[PDB]
Amino acid sequence: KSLGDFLKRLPEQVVNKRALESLVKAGALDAFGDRARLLASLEPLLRWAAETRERGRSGLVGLFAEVEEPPLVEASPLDEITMLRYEKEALGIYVSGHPVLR
Amino acid sequence: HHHHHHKAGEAQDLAEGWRAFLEALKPTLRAFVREARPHLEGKTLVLRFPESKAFHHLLPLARAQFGVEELAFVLEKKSLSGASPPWEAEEGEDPSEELRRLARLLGGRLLWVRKPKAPEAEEPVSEDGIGGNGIMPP
DNA sequence: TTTGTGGCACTGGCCGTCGTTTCG
DNA sequence: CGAAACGACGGCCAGTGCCA
């Protein structure tokens, strides 16, 4: 349902911060927001995701074991040149447009 | 909730106005309001879902008992705004007094002052370049 | 032969285990 | 004498570089 729902559910143990970055860059998480906004919100929501577990890992359940995800931390939209540069990094090929077509 | 997901910086921050359907800005919630209206509806139809909220007291359930008689923004295009060596030049007002061409440029000029140049800033292409061209038929 | 590609080995970053040293 | 807590180190995974 969200980036937070993705982080608290799949821990850093499994999907590490290095993997999460390119997963945003490749476009796998585009259904939750802007790439720049998502990338920025990684480490804050990661701390929040790790914080949600220890609430459940010492009593509590949901309402008191989870202060629901905060809004996505704001950032400027990426330009196509630096956006398509991340797609090549994340997928090994210029997926979805070539920088020259701008 | 698909429009809330598209959020990019302050873009959807200044998007509830573009809908609009508010009351003189913001009575009740850190709106959007269009996130409480589908929740009231629920799923797609479904009568338990519309009813639920109705028993306690998409678009026309909202029209029933809600703050509507105010009118702020319109489109979808309306704006407003979202307020709640060569350079220009000469000087500068606006409207422009050295360039520029003649539609939707003043608006840019209007926005501009001041005072960096370049820089370029999103990302390219023209602006300094065009200025250069004019300093160029001096 | 001068180019690209697919497999496999090497480094670094993080993580979790084990062993030692200290304190009670 | 035994428990704990801190630091070392392996290895594991991944990102890379090479060579066939």
Distance CA A73, CA A27 (A): 18
**Cα distance between residue B88 and residue B99, in whole Å:** 7
Query: For chain B, what is the domain count?
Result: 2
CATH number of B110's domain: 1.10.40.100
Phi, psi (deg, nearest 5) at residue A22: -75, -25
Handedness of CA B3, B7, B12, B18 (dihedral sign): negative
Neighbours of A50 (CB within 10 A): 14
Is residue B101, in this structure, part of any structural domain at all?
yes
| Best CA proximity match to B80, nearest among B5, B25, B36 | B25
Are B68 and B98 in the same domain? no
* Nominal resolution (angstroms): 3.2
Radius of gyration of chain A (CA): 16
Phi then psi dihedrals of residue A57, to 5 deg? -85, 20
Residues B57 and B101 in one domain: no
Sort residue B65 into left (φ over 0), alpha (ψ -120 to 50) or beta: left
Helix then strand count (H, E) for chain B reads: 6, 0
| Cβ contacts of A100 within 8 Å, gap of 6 or more | none
Structural domain of B106: 93-138
Residue B115 included in any domain: yes
Residue B105: inside a domain, yes or no?
yes
Contacts of residue A80, defined as CB under 8 A and 6 or more positions apart, other chains included, come to: A97, A99, A102
Show residues of chain B in contact with A36, CB under 8 Å.
8-9
Q: Which nucleotide is nearest to A19 (CA to C1')?
A: D14
If we measure between CA atoms, which residue out of B138, B22, B127 comes closest to residue B71? B22
Is B98 found in the same domain as B72? no
Q: Do A37 and B8 touch (CB under 8 A)?
A: yes
Distance CA A86, CA A77 (A): 13
Residue B88's CB is within 10 A of a number of other CB atoms, namely 20
Are B69 and B106 within one domain? no
Q: What residue spans of chain A are helical by DSSP H?
A: 3-9, 17-26, 35-40, 42-56, 80-91
Determination approach: X-ray
Is residue B55 a part of any domain in this protein?
yes
Does the CB of A10 sit below 7 A from strand D? no
Retrieve residue B46's tokens: 């479904």
Listed in sequence order, the residues at least 6 apart from B116 whose beta carbon sits closer than 8 Å to its beta carbon are: none
Q: Closest by alpha carbon to A34, among B77, B4, B120?
A: B4
